[PDB]
Design goal:
The PDB classes it as ribosome. This is part of a larger assembly, with 2 copies of chain A, 1 copy of chain B (about 140 residues), 1 copy of chain C (about 55 residues), 2 copies of chain D, 1 copy of chain F (about 350 residues) and 1 copy of chain H (about 270 residues). Chain A is about 45% helix and about 0% strand. With about 40 residues, chain A is an all-alpha fold. Chain B is α/β, with parallel strands linked by helices. Classes of the chains: A mainly alpha (about 40), B alpha/beta (about 140), C mainly alpha (about 55), D mainly alpha (about 70), F alpha+beta (about 350), H mainly beta (about 270).
Chain lengths: ~40, ~140, ~55, ~70, ~40, ~350, ~40, ~270
């Protein structure tokens, strides 16, 4: 049978590793999406 | 200072093609081997100098306008092909060229016809050279 | 000794067959003579000039 | 708190600071990077039991006519 | 768990179908070892 | 009941020939007298490969491992991965699949893992440039072998992908009664995890022998380095004699061991190929079995292939006897009218084989 | 913006300049340049 | 132990730590013992070959024109019958001892000077170091090219061959010690052992472990299998010039530009 809604994700280690790599890569370049004074 | 000397030698005061397909054809005709080395001239943005970096062991590029060369450096800084790439300032006619197995470059049309005979004269010339010229010439 | 007959006479072994009118395919590379013998046999490239252009 | 410990752990293994200091092999450094990364993740300081589900999905991830029947002893 | 596998499977077959149809509508209206050279350098 | 065979001789072919014919076979007394009797690991792995590409087959291995009963199914194919044991390279497993690819329900996309070269088996380039051209001559338009990794012995680590897009009812009837004229010599000299200088040195040795010829010589330098060079350093050379007039090829290949001189290998392999031509009339020996089988499974029509007397050896005899036992087809040889050479013409009637597994 | 360029030519090491005489020099203005004895001795 | 220096060679007993005999010699670059320690053979910068008999306390015979250029390196076979000379003339000359006198047998031309010459203990292979940063290994018996080693920034100053003979270590002015397998010529791994160049590197006998000495005056105890430094030893203020290992391997002697020679003994 099919399912109506998107299943809730699980934070497995591979997803954690992939997420952490992106976080590390962003800070290597200092590419930060943060608010600044106008 | 180093900066004052650089300003004196060049004041730091060319239109380029954007269609990639012809550039791919230019690369295909050269058929550069990994063992073989290439001399680059007037590299410009470095969209062409990266292609030769992809298919050649080593690349040394000579640019007319020093600013146009400098940004080419910034493009390659911190890249695997950074070691291979080299840059030069001042016209190729003027200084002895490093020995190269093929000539691929964006030759200026003013020096294009002079360029070819230098290749013919220069000992150990490239076995094949691919260049862009004016249709009439 | 027509070979065409000898091949289908299962009683005669192939090694017996080959000699009269004159090991395992799992080895793809076929049998060859010793290297030094082959090298001498061809110090010239004659006997094949017909095959090549 | 945690940042102080992480700074100390990197400094103890020499992962931070000046390299040209005047007056550790690289392979061991990568081992330290692996150790500090796994040590400083409490979710995967240690978290309470049951907060992660990893061994669950992995078991699930592990979970044609005719075939060879091999009677060889 | 089985729900997620189905979503992935249904996504895959849908993508494969549309790619095939893009080909059919394309058709109706050289070197097989080139990538080896790139893989040589590593 | 079952067509019975003896020993491990022609193990892959007898299984393949059974699969193409659909006739069940029994192979018995496999290494009965040996200290380690029965099937080897790589032969067992080959049987598993046969199952992955067929459906409905029944394979029985005896309690002692010295007898195999094979009841073939239909060739269905599909995408799968095969791990080749270190005892044999990938070519051991790729070669039999070539006999089956054009006659499957679905395209084979088989991914092979393991060592990619040996002294005793077909190498990659032997498959790619040495047998694959032959299948093209027989009607297989689309077929390719892609090397995702090279793995030299003993640790291997190579990766090769076999893709045969062309599905055909049966191979075209063969008509080749002339000696193809060699137009040029090509080849590939390859190395893994080592300096490029070695590849240049094999080419130097091969060129030394073959420079005396009148035709063009161009050997590719295939140096593998980095992550993609496998787990073991190694090197080898393959040469191919090409006949562009009718797309015929002759090839020799070998790899270098520890203690071997790169130039000597180039000289030997150059000194190897030039023998296969002298022993060949229309096809070299190492692709003859592929050619012979294809004509047998052709349309019910007399195909003609020219062979040299040097090619009719014990290998050729056992091959034909195996075909007759399974297909009942006989290969007839007639003299050529010429006196310059002593070649033969092999005339084979096809059985009218058709790919019934494929969609229409 | 020329000065920022000029500093960029100074930072990278693989840079060389030709004078009007044809000599091969670095950006700083100094001419850019094994011995069997020195390496063993 | 024999200490070769400009204008002076001396042979010192380890127990005494003092000279037994002293021999007048030239600007010697390479020093070697003949089998049994009876005689000492040296190579000058001029290129004249010097052969001393320790018992005699005097030179046996000098061959002024044996070699035109400086004898950079010298090595001998285990039997000692065959002697190989590596030098600046870019030709390797093989010398055979005949009753004791030295006679030239053959010369092998090379494109580049032989900075270092090493012969395997089994005498199956012979290694040549060149200023071109390329190490050429020849079968000693057949005198034919076997394999090559590339990639060193600067010429390899020292080559050593393991007891098992499957291993070749090459130390260079590149300041990286590289570990090359003989069977196929592959590099298993490369070590930046010393900041400055590693003048000499030696295998501990009957072990894959190797000693390294460099201009920074360090002596390091490195295992090939582990590829890491077991221990680090500093005792010389100035650069250590050469390192010699005992046949047992129990003790290793090192000499430095500070004119102080020190024995490192295994405990």
């Amino acid at each position: 049978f099919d399912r109506t809604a998107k299943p809730v994700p699980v934070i497995t280690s591979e997803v954690t590793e992939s997420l952490e790599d992106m976080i590390r890569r962003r800070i290597q370049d200092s590419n930060f999406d943060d608010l600044q004074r106008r | 200072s180093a900066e004052k000397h650089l300003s004196s030698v060049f004041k730091f005061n060319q239109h380029i093609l954007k269609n990639p397909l012809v550039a791919q054809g230019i690369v295909d005709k050269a058929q550069i081997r990994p063992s073989d080395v290439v001399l680059e001239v007037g590299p410009g943005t470095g969209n062409l100098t990266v292609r030769i970096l992809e298919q050649a062991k080593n690349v040394v590029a000579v640019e007319m306008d020093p600013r146009m060369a400098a940004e080419l450096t910034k493009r390659v800084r911190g890249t695997p092909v950074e070691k291979k790439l080299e840059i030069m300032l001042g016209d190729f006619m003027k200084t002895e060229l490093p020995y190269f197995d093929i000539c691929i470059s964006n030759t200026p049309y003013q020096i294009s016809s002079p360029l070819v005979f230098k290749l013919i004269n220069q000992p150990r010339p490239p076995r094949v050279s691919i260049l862009m010229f004016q249709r009439e010439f | 000794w027509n070979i065409g007959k000898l091949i289908y006479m299962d009683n005669i072994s192939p090694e017996e067959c080959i000699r009269r009118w004159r090991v395992d395919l799992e080895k793809f590379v076929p049998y060859f003579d010793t290297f030094e013998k082959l090298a001498k046999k061809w110090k010239s490239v004659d006997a094949i000039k017909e095959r090549f252009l | 708190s945690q940042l102080k410990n992480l700074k100390a752990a990197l400094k103890a293994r020499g992962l931070t600071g000046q390299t040209n200091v005047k007056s550790y092999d690289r392979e061991e450094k990568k081992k330290a990077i692996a150790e500090i990364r796994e040590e400083f993740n409490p979710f995967e300081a240690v978290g309470k039991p049951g907060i992660s589900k990893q061994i669950g999905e992995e078991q699930r991830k592990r979970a044609k006519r005719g075939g060879v029947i091999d009677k060889r002893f | 768990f089985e729900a997620r596998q189905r979503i992935e499977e249904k996504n895959k077959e849908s993508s494969d179908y549309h790619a095939k149809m893009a080909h059919i509508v394309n058709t109706i209206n050289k070197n097989k070892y080139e990538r080896e050279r790139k893989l040589r350098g590593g | 009941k079952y067509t019975t065979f003896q020993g491990s001789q022609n193990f892959r072919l007898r299984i393949v020939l059974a699969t193409l014919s659909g006739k069940p076979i029994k192979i018995e007394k496999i290494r009965s007298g040996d200290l380690n009797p029965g099937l080897k690991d790589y032969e067992v792995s080959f049987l598993r490969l046969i199952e992955s590409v067929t459906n409905g087959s029944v394979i029985e291995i005896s309690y002692t491992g010295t007898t195999v009963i094979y009841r073939p199914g239909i060739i269905v194919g599909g995408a799968s991965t095969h791990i080749c044991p270190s005892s044999k390279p990938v070519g051991y497993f790729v070669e039999p699949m070539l006999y089956l690819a054009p006659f499957s329900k679905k395209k084979f996309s088989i991914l092979f893992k393991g060592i990619t070269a040996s002294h005793n088996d077909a190498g990659i380039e032997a498959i790619k440039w040495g047998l694959m051209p032959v299948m093209e001559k027989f009607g297989v338009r689309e077929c390719a072998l892609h090397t995702l990794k090279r793995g030299s012995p003993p640790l291997g680590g190579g990766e090769v992908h076999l893709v045969v897009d062309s599905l055909i009812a049966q191979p075209i009837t063969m008509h080749e009664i002339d000696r193809p004229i060699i137009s040029s010599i090509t080849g590939v000299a390859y190395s893994t995890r080592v300096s490029p200088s070695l590849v240049n040195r094999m080419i130097d040795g091969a060129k030394k022998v073959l420079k005396n010829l009148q035709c063009e010589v161009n050997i590719t330098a295939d140096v593998w380095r980095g992550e993609n060079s496998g787990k073991s350093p190694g090197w080898g050379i393959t040469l191919v004699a090409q006949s562009k007039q009718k797309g015929w090829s002759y090839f020799a290949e070998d790899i270098g061991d520890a203690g071997s001189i790169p130039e000597e290998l180039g000289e030997k392999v150059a000194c190897q190929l030039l023998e296969e031509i002298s022993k060949s009339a229309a096809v070299g020996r190492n692709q003859l079995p592929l050619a012979i089988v294809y004509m047998v499974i052709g349309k019910e029509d007399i195909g003609r292939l020219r062979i040299n007397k040097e090619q009719i050896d014990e290998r050729f005899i056992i091959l034909l006897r195996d075909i007759k036992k399974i297909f009942n087809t006989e290969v007839f040889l007639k003299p050529v009218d010429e006196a310059d050479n002593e070649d033969m013409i092999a005339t084979i009637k096809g059985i009218g084989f058709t790919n019934t597994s494929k969609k229409i | 913006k020329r000065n920022d360029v000029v500093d960029t030519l100074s930072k990278a090491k693989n840079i060389t300049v030709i004078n009007q005489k044809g000599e091969k020099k670095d950006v700083s203005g100094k001419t850019k340049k094994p011995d069997s004895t020195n390496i063993k001795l | 132990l024999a200490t070769a220096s400009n204008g002076s060679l001396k042979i010192w007993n380890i127990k005494t730590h003092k000279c037994i005999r002293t021999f007048e010699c030239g600007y010697a670059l390479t020093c070697k013992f003949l089998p049994g320690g009876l005689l000492v053979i040296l190579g000058t910068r001029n290129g004249e070959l010097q052969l001393f008999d320790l018992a005699s306390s005097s030179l046996l015979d000098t061959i002024e024109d044996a070699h035109d250029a400086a004898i950079w390196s010298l090595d001998l076979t285990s039997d000692g019958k065959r002697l190989v000379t590596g030098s600046a003339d870019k030709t390797v000359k093989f010398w055979d001892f005949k009753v004791l006198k030295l006679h030239h047998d053959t010369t092998l031309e090379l494109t580049d000077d032989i900075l270092c010459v090493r012969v395997s203990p089994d005498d199956r292979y012979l290694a040549i170091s060149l200023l071109d940063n390329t190490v050429k290994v020849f079968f000693l018996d057949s005198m034919k090219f076997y394999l090559s080693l590339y990639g060193h920034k600067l010429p390899v100053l020292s080559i050593d061959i393991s007891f098992d003979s499957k291993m070749i270590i090459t130390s260079s002015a590149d300041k990286n010690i590289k570990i090359w397998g003989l069977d196929f010529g592959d590099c298993h791994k490369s070590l930046f052992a010393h900041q400055d160049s590693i003048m000499n590197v030696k295998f501990l006998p009957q072990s894959h472990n190797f000693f390294s000495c460099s201009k920074d005056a360090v002596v390091k105890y490195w295992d090939g299998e582990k590829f890491e430094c077991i221990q680090k030893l500093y005792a010389h203020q100035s650069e250590v010039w050469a390192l010699a290992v005992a046949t047992d391997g129990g003790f290793v002697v090192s000499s430095s530009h500070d004119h102080s020679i020190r024995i490192w003994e295994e405990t």
